[PDB]
Amino acid sequence: SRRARRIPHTAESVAFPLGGIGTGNVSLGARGELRDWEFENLPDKGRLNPRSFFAIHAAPQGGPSATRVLEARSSGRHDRDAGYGFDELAGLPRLDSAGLHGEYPVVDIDFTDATLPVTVSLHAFTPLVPLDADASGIPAAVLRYRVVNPGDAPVTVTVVGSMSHTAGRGAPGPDAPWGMRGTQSVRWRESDGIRGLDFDIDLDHDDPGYGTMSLTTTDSSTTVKPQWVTSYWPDGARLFWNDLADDGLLAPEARLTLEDKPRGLFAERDADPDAPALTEEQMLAKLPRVRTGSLGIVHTLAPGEERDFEFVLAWSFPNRRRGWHGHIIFDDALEDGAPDLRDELGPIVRNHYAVRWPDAWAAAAQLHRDLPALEGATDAFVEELYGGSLDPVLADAVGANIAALRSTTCFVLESPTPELGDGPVFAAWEGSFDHGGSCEGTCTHVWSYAQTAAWLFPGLERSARRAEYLLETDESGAQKFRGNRIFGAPRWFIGPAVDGQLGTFLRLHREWRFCGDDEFLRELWPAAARTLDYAAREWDHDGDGLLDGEMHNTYDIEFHGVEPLSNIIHLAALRAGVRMAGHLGDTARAQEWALRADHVAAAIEGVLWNGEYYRQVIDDVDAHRYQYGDGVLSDQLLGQFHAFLGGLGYLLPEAHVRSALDAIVQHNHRGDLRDHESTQRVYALNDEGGLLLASWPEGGRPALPFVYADEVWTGIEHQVAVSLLFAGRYDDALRIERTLRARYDGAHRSPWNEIECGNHYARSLASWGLLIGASGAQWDAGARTLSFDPVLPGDARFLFTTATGWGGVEIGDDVITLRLHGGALDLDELRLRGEVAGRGIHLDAGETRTLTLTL
């Protein structure tokens, strides 16, 4: 019995990512293969790790043995240009089928095979502990193979992991013989309560490419080949399979190379033949530089017996080259006016995880030592996220997209700049191209959509807000939307985006509301208030209160005229600003902004509202390229998404907000795209559906609309779905999410990778809002109040988080129950549907309280 939908081994795009926040990753495919080896501070989809696989030797008592790689057979194209290569070991026998059942962060892959005399499943995960970014940021994974004997005789089983270290690649050069800038090492090690293989490399400690790996177990019943033979030809693999398939046991290799000297095709041109053998060490110095080892675990299973064969795979690449080194913020794109600290600071910035764990073994030792608590938290998380009342579609959308936050798109730097003081700083690309970062600078117009980190790892988001307000905001309140100064470099010379700058203000409110830390807010307040004032002063040119004229946005273009994206975000920002200003005692600003907001709201209703939705008012929709006029913009109510999430309620008349959301769905949602015409980028096509960025149901399409109008972005789908949940439009929210997640169901794209400008795209983290909207969760740390208001009536059960603690809430039978899995919770009031359920509620981790509602 599996709760998650079975994804077949034929679904080639599927990749379940292991790893945690900022650690880099390796993934499991639906065949149970390891893939996408990307530990080294850059994405690397498709990177093959030579000779890195799990295998089984099953020896039935009195029967023929079977030796297989623990993967389902490949399918689809087999036309590799040089065949599947030696180091892929594609020619070893594999299993009939598999089914992958992912409830991120946990996966189960159940193998089926008619020849193997045992049945195998893989359970794998990297712990996720809500509100604990370090515990959720271990550079390691559990790979636990459960083996069952369904037969009638005992079977002696060996499960063996064979692994190469990934470190050391280099571009052709005198420093990179054999494509490797250093020689790897591997050794058997037993220390720190664990045992297994410890990999290293003789690169300098400060080399960006320096790193370690380990494959370990706490199981005493091991058989090992610590280092495979390194020859010119792949003798090592052949000898490994001979050794395993013979007896299910392994031995260390007596000779680490079978070469005596360079010979034949490998001979040195200027070499004397009849020259005698070199020593083993001299010969190894001339040979390939990757090392491989095998760790086996051996147990005999009686008929009906089940046993776990448990491994940890760990890694460490502590060093990043200082700087984004992206594709936007080049030296010819820096402004002066902020001094360049980069010389004065080292050329390396460390990954935060490398402070706690100096190398791979340290991370493995911790994961193994603390496994019961780390796994127990992870399991409690999974049960609350996937085992509650949410439609499975919504739980899928919320949980699967956490992978983006734990992907190469995001990372955590240790003390990159003295301007922020000491400690970790979260930063991120927008996305991950297959082999490089996409769109540097913790881009504010994109990241404003992302909600997941604000509810699961709020300290990360706070650390980023500090960078924006302390480093990227000038004295006028102009804020950059890509941040370069985290690295001690000058700012990017491009100026503000309206969505970026005002969405960052909204996020400051969100962060402050979650944590209740007025000192956090006070530090950033002079800068933040300037960025809100900047809008009314600089972006309203006709004095009506509506932002108007040329403003840059997340569509990489400027809107002209007067339109809702900018204005409804501004309205939301003003309302948030009143809450913050008022609480801090900035009473003058609070009253000014409240009155401004009232005017903005009336002007939006008077000008942008058309009786059905909000739209762009412009003299001539074709005067400027890249406009939309009377089209329906899916993001017209983005401000209202933030407002709902921020506890600010409706910004505009409820019937008009619901009308506009209904118009977005009715006009912009496509169930099928056969008849769609787009010259734009494709994230949805053919017999898929999706929410278009814009459409023109009443005409008025420009010759050249904004450049993404005909596209489908999951982040925009999510935000609209969220708003629909808050507005009571459940069926339409579910329609949007079912349609979107169908595009990511494994058939054509992976559930764990929603894409836009890059894999693991930050905008996809809008999805967390589905949980908040479905549950009506409103946590106000300043007031110490928690309320719920589920979209659907009757019984409900959801995950929730707050700054102090996390757990489950269960509603129904005229009661409300809180169960706290981590931290603490101290509530002045708990409300349900606007009514007080209880006062003065104090819980610690492991406790539950059930309150009966008033009749």
Q: Which residues bind ligand BXX (CB under 6 A)?
A: 81-82, 85, 430, 433-435, 439, 445-446, 554, 556, 670, 675-676, 695, 756-757
Torsion of CA 522, 527, 529, 531, to 10 degrees: -150
Strand partners, 830: 786, 838
Residue pair 751/102 in contact (Cβ under 8 Å)? The answer is: yes
Candidates 753, 775, 802, 804: give the one binding its own copies (CB under 8 A).
Answer: 753
The residue (of 546 and 734) whose beta carbon lies closer to Mg ion is 546
680 binds, among its own copies, ligand BXX, Cl ion, none (CB under 5 to 8 A by kind): its own copies
Candidates 647, 758, 790, 823: give the one binding its own copies (CB under 8 A).
Answer: 758
* Amino acid identity, position 685: L
Rounded Cα gap, residues 306 and 601, in angstroms: 65
The residue (of 187 and 435) whose beta carbon lies closer to its own copies is 435
CB of 16 vs Mg ion, minimal distance in Å: 19
238 binds its own copies (CB under 8 A): yes
CB of 695 vs ligand BXX, minimal distance in Å: 5
176 binds its own copies (CB under 8 A): no
Q: What are phi and psi of 266, to 5 degrees?
A: -95, 0
* Amino acid identity, position 737: E
CB of 703 vs Mg ion, minimal distance in Å: 12
The residue (of 306 and 550) whose beta carbon lies closer to Mg ion is 550
For 469-474, the CB contacts below 8 A with 24+ separation are: 469/508, 469/523, 469/524, 469/527, 469/528, 469/531, 470/419, 470/420, 470/523, 470/524, 470/527, 471/338, 471/417, 471/419, 471/420, 473/527, 473/528, 473/530, 473/531, 474/337
Closest alpha carbon to 152 in 66, 59, 60, 64: 60
Binding mask 358-377 for its own copies (x = CB under 8 A): --------------------
Rounded Cα gap, residues 320 and 352, in angstroms: 11
CB of 216 vs ligand BXX, minimal distance in Å: 32
384 binds, among Cl ion, its own copies, Mg ion, none (CB under 5 to 8 A by kind): none
| Tokens encoding 734 | 């579910």
73 binds, among Mg ion, ligand BXX, its own copies, none (CB under 5 to 8 A by kind): its own copies
Rounded Cα gap, residues 732 and 393, in angstroms: 13
439 binds, among its own copies, Mg ion, ligand BXX, none (CB under 5 to 8 A by kind): ligand BXX
Q: How far is CA 762 from the centre of its chain?
A: 8
130 binds Cl ion (CB under 5 A): no
The residue (of 41 and 723) whose beta carbon lies closer to its own copies is 41
CB of 131 vs Cl ion, minimal distance in Å: 6
Rounded Cα gap, residues 431 and 429, in angstroms: 5
CB of 676 vs ligand BXX, minimal distance in Å: 4
Rounded Cα gap, residues 674 and 683, in angstroms: 14
| Tokens encoding 348 | 């390396």
Residue pair 35/752 in contact (Cβ under 8 Å)? The answer is: no
Stretch that binds its own copies, among 191-199, 561-569, 591-599, 755-763 (CB under 8 A): 755-763
Q: List Cβ neighbours of 560 (8 Å cut-off, separation of 6 or more).
A: 549, 550, 618, 623, 624, 627
CB of 701 vs ligand BXX, minimal distance in Å: 10
- Considering only residues 556 to 575 of the shown chain, the ones binding its own copies according to CB under 8 A are 556-558
457 binds, among its own copies, ligand BXX, Cl ion, none (CB under 5 to 8 A by kind): Cl ion
- Considering only residues 656 to 675 of the shown chain, the ones binding its own copies according to CB under 8 A are 673-675
The residue (of 17 and 647) whose beta carbon lies closer to its own copies is 17
Rounded Cα gap, residues 351 and 361, in angstroms: 16
Residue pair 333/327 in contact (Cβ under 8 Å)? The answer is: no
Rounded Cα gap, residues 716 and 683, in angstroms: 12
* Amino acid identity, position 132: D
- Considering only residues 712 to 751 of the shown chain, the ones binding its own copies according to CB under 8 A are 743, 748-750
Cis before residue 105, ω within 30 degrees of 0?
A: yes
Residue pair 120/31 in contact (Cβ under 8 Å)? The answer is: no
Binding mask 267-306 for its own copies (x = CB under 8 A): x-xx------------------------------------
CB of 306 vs ligand BXX, minimal distance in Å: 30
Residue pair 270/296 in contact (Cβ under 8 Å)? The answer is: no
The residue (of 255 and 350) whose beta carbon lies closer to Cl ion is 255
The count of residues in the chain is 855
Residues binding its own copies: what is the number (CB under 8 A)?
87
Stretch that binds its own copies, among 134-142, 235-243, 460-468, 841-849 (CB under 8 A): 235-243
Closest alpha carbon to 784 in 831, 748, 735, 752: 831
Dihedral sign from CA coordinates of 419, 424, 430, 431: positive
Which residue is listed with tokens 């515990």?
135
670 binds, among ligand BXX, Cl ion, its own copies, none (CB under 5 to 8 A by kind): ligand BXX
The closest residue (CB) to ligand BXX is 757
Rounded Cα gap, residues 715 and 722, in angstroms: 11
412 binds, among Mg ion, ligand BXX, Cl ion, none (CB under 5 to 8 A by kind): none
Rounded Cα gap, residues 246 and 612, in angstroms: 75
844 binds, among Cl ion, its own copies, Mg ion, none (CB under 5 to 8 A by kind): Mg ion
The residue (of 417 and 750) whose beta carbon lies closer to ligand BXX is 750
Q: Is 473 helix (H, G, I), strand (E, B) or coil?
A: strand
CB of 669 vs ligand BXX, minimal distance in Å: 10
Rounded Cα gap, residues 411 and 413, in angstroms: 7
Rounded Cα gap, residues 189 and 420, in angstroms: 40
160 binds its own copies (CB under 8 A): no
Q: Is 792 helix (H, G, I), strand (E, B) or coil?
A: coil
407 binds its own copies (CB under 8 A): no
624 binds, among ligand BXX, Cl ion, Mg ion, none (CB under 5 to 8 A by kind): Cl ion
757 binds, among Mg ion, Cl ion, its own copies, none (CB under 5 to 8 A by kind): its own copies
CB of 551 vs Mg ion, minimal distance in Å: 9
| Tokens encoding 550 | 């040329």
833 binds its own copies (CB under 8 A): no
- Considering only residues 494 to 533 of the shown chain, the ones binding its own copies according to CB under 8 A are 494
CB of 456 vs Cl ion, minimal distance in Å: 8
Rounded Cα gap, residues 63 and 657, in angstroms: 71
CB of 426 vs Cl ion, minimal distance in Å: 9
* DSSP of 401-432: THHHHTSTTEEEEES--GGG-SSEEEEE-SEE
- Considering only residues 85 to 144 of the shown chain, the ones binding its own copies according to CB under 8 A are 85-86, 88-94, 115
- Considering only residues 568 to 627 of the shown chain, the ones binding Cl ion according to CB under 5 A are 624-625
CB of 701 vs its own copies, minimal distance in Å: 10
Stretch that binds its own copies, among 77-85, 190-198, 220-228, 534-542 (CB under 8 A): 77-85
The residue (of 319 and 554) whose beta carbon lies closer to ligand BXX is 554
- Considering only residues 208 to 227 of the shown chain, the ones binding its own copies according to CB under 8 A are none
548 binds, among Cl ion, ligand BXX, Mg ion, none (CB under 5 to 8 A by kind): Mg ion
Residue pair 658/675 in contact (Cβ under 8 Å)? The answer is: no
Q: What are phi and psi of 818, to 5 degrees?
A: -110, 130
* DSSP of 424-446: EEEEE-SEE-SSSEES-S--HHH
Q: Is 593 helix (H, G, I), strand (E, B) or coil?
A: helix
133 binds Cl ion (CB under 5 A): yes
The residue (of 200 and 310) whose beta carbon lies closer to Mg ion is 200
747 binds, among Mg ion, ligand BXX, Cl ion, none (CB under 5 to 8 A by kind): Mg ion
Rule CB under 5 A: which residues touch Cl ion?
A: 133, 457, 459, 624-625
